[PDB]
Amino acid sequence: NLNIVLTCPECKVYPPKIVERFSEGDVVCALCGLVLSDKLVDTRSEWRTFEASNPLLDGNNLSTRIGKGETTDMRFTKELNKAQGKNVMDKKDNEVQAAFAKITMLCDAAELPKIVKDCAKEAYKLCHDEKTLKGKSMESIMAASILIGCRRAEVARTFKEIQSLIHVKTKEFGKTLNIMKNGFLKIDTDNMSRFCSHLGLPMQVTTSAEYTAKKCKEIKEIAGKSPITIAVVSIYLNILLFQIPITAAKVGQTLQVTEGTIKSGYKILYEHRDKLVDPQLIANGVVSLDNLP
């Protein structure tokens, strides 16, 4: 049985920090004031690029890839590049690797952030194993690793827009939204950052839309409306009351909703427009002038 301890011995306390020291080392107790070993292990001094490795899936090794200008690989390059290309057929080598390489291609193209862009791809490798009603489509659970990957910051989304991009935004996206929950609800001020950035509006408009939407809810003006709708609605009130305006087709297009729908919530909150804005709000166009819709 592995027991590891630094107990002073002379006056067992069971137990207290003994110091790491600065130069002398050995962790002498501030109690018996004795010694313990010699230390001699600098953890600060890790292997830099100048050997260290940060593996996230299994264990990384590598093979071949010869390029040192000493003797030309020519004949031997193809001897070994073919020989290592034969070996990646023995025990289901493909799958995780194919998934992580195709993963870095789909994210890089939309310019998804690496720190959290890579985080969601770890989630996929946890989701590709385990067998819980996946009805797996490859693309489907990829839109989960496209959402949590964009969760770093609203880098590309505005997740709805990246959903509206490409293929499969509907029932197959539903199976995936459930897999991720197996969360916190999603609110007005959740998509405001992204929606506004894609819409290209200023911090002014963002903040007011964000204050309108919260009061729309606080005032229960939009009973059973989807938060996305409320948000896209509020973003229309805000922006329309500023200079930098955007149309319902422009807002709907980024929010991922339909003008009809945005009109529905908008018209529900318009009658309280006054009580909804920031207070210190500017106004290129005033409330008595906002589109009634």
Added chain:
Amino acid sequence: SGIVPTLQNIVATVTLGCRLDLKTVALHARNAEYNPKRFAAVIMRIREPKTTALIFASGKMVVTGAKSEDDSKLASRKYARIIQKIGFAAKFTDFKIQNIVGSCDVKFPIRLEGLAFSHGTFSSYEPELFPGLIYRMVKPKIVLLIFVSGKIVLTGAKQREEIYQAFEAIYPVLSEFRKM
């Protein structure tokens, strides 16, 4: 609670015990539609009790739309009687209710997201997909669809009593999240 959920739909199965020529049934029965290219069964409806039956070549059928256990058995008997009257050795066998759906109205609004966050292990709420909250009750095993309006849908029951017990169990939590 003071309220009693209303049974809205009952699904039952019946084995008529004898093979059927769906093409013939569709030809001699009124209000029947048969399109094998999309569904290998004859869809037939009657007015009393207002129901719809799915009749198969195997002689087995599903009766839907009934609002009471009696109407379900009664309707099932009429369909079997028609199959016979057409010319088959059909018999009324293995009658069994497979699902009962009921609805309510607690009369007050409900803050759904608060209810979902509170009972996360039983409820799934994402207005984006569906406006109502899906509550999967354990005992009895009944699925509820809770709406902001106070409207309640209860399904998955085999005995009408389960709908009633499901509603009584959920009423306290519905009340707790009442918007007031």
Added chain:
Amino acid sequence: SFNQFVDYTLQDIICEDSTLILEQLAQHTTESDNISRKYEISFGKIYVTKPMVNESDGVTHALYPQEARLRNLTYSSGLFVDVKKRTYEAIDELKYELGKVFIGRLPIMLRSKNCYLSEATESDLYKLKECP
């Protein structure tokens, strides 16, 4: 040196190999065979913005040298190229026909044509917290 590379050299690099084509010629058996096609992808004019930054919350805005040094960013601007995608087809010899894309962020050299500080006066630089 840098200016010459941005104003001229950059365009010529986009135009040397440039266009790439892929041809899909059929088996000539019978429909749906006997269809030979050739698809084109072409690269036209190259554009280059003033230096910008893509924050975490989507918003893109101008970026001055001082903000780069403090927030440890890169003082780079956007590279944009006109792309065109043509399509052609023949039956079992005659080829018949059936925008601006972001490609990368190129770091700018300070005081170059593309840098904000190029047409900057003395008092200008001071407000920009740069040393003249």
